[PDB]
């Protein structure tokens, strides 16, 4: 679990979105495993605007933050998980590291702020859904 709180926006994994998220929907994309809903309170997070390939992510299943190198956002084949079939996921970044299903929502950050959230794992990789292209998160 986990979300990004930027302005009056909540960014979650689409597969973990609540009824309240869907009832307050701003934007969702299944191919990216992202959903954004409206908030009443303003949030503490800053979105990275950058092409960093190094940063740090939170892994709830280790209670640890790990420094990683990660690929640039790409269209990647993902094997079946408890929450999705085998399918192609867009805007996905991969690193070498530990990720189980409950680790989804964990933040990946770089020197510029929040890069994305854990979305995939298995086979010694963790995949992160990028949010750095979502410029509209920073306004309105």
Ligand X SMILES: CNS(=O)(=O)c1ccccc1Cl
- Cβ atoms within 10 Å, residue 1: 12
* 3 state SS of 24: coil
Chain positions contacting ligand X, by CB under 6 A: 73-75, 90-91
Told to judge if 33 belongs to the known catalytic residues of this protein, a careful annotator would answer yes
Alpha carbon 77 to its chain's center: 17
User: Residue 14 touches which of Zn ion, ligand X, none (CB < 5 to 8 A by kind)?
Assistant: none
8-state DSSP, 79: -
Asked if 48 touches Zn ion (CB under 5 A), the answer is yes
Asked if 110 touches Zn ion (CB under 5 A), the answer is yes
Please give the Cα distance from 54 to 105 (Å, whole number): 18
Asked if 52 touches Zn ion (CB under 5 A), the answer is yes
- Residue 47, both tokens: 């979105």
By C-alpha distance, which of 21, 105, 19 is closest to 60?
105
Q: Which helix (H) or strand (E) holds 127?
A: strand 125-130
Asked if 65 touches Zn ion (CB under 5 A), the answer is no
* Residue selected from 50, 75, 80, 96 as contacting Zn ion according to rule CB under 5 A: 50
Asked if 112 touches Zn ion (CB under 5 A), the answer is yes
Told to judge if 104 belongs to the known catalytic residues of this protein, a careful annotator would answer yes
Out of 21, 59, 103, 104, the active site residue is 104
User: Residue 110 touches which of Zn ion, ligand X, none (CB < 5 to 8 A by kind)?
Assistant: Zn ion
Told to judge if 15 belongs to the known catalytic residues of this protein, a careful annotator would answer yes
Closer CB to Zn ion, residue 52 or residue 56? 52
Rg of the chain (C-alpha set): 14
Asked if 25 touches Zn ion (CB under 5 A), the answer is no
């Amino acid at each position: 679990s986990g979300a990004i709180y930027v302005g009056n926006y909540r960014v979650v994994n689409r597969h973990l979105a609540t009824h309240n998220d869907w009832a307050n929907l701003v934007w969702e994309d299944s191919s990216r495993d992202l959903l954004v809903s409206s908030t009443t309170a303003q949030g503490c997070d800053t979105i990275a605007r950058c092409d960093c390939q190094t940063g740090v992510y939170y892994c709830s299943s280790r209670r640890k933050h790990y420094p990683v190198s990660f690929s640039k956002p790409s269209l990647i084949f993902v094997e079946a998980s408890e929450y999705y079939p085998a399918r192609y996921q867009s805007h996905l970044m991969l690193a070498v590291g530990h990720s189980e299903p409950g680790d989804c929502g964990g933040i990946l950050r770089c020197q510029h702020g929040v890069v994305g959230i854990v979305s995939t794992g298995g086979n010694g990789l963790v995949g992160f859904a990028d949010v750095r292209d979502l410029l509209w998160l920073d306004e309105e």
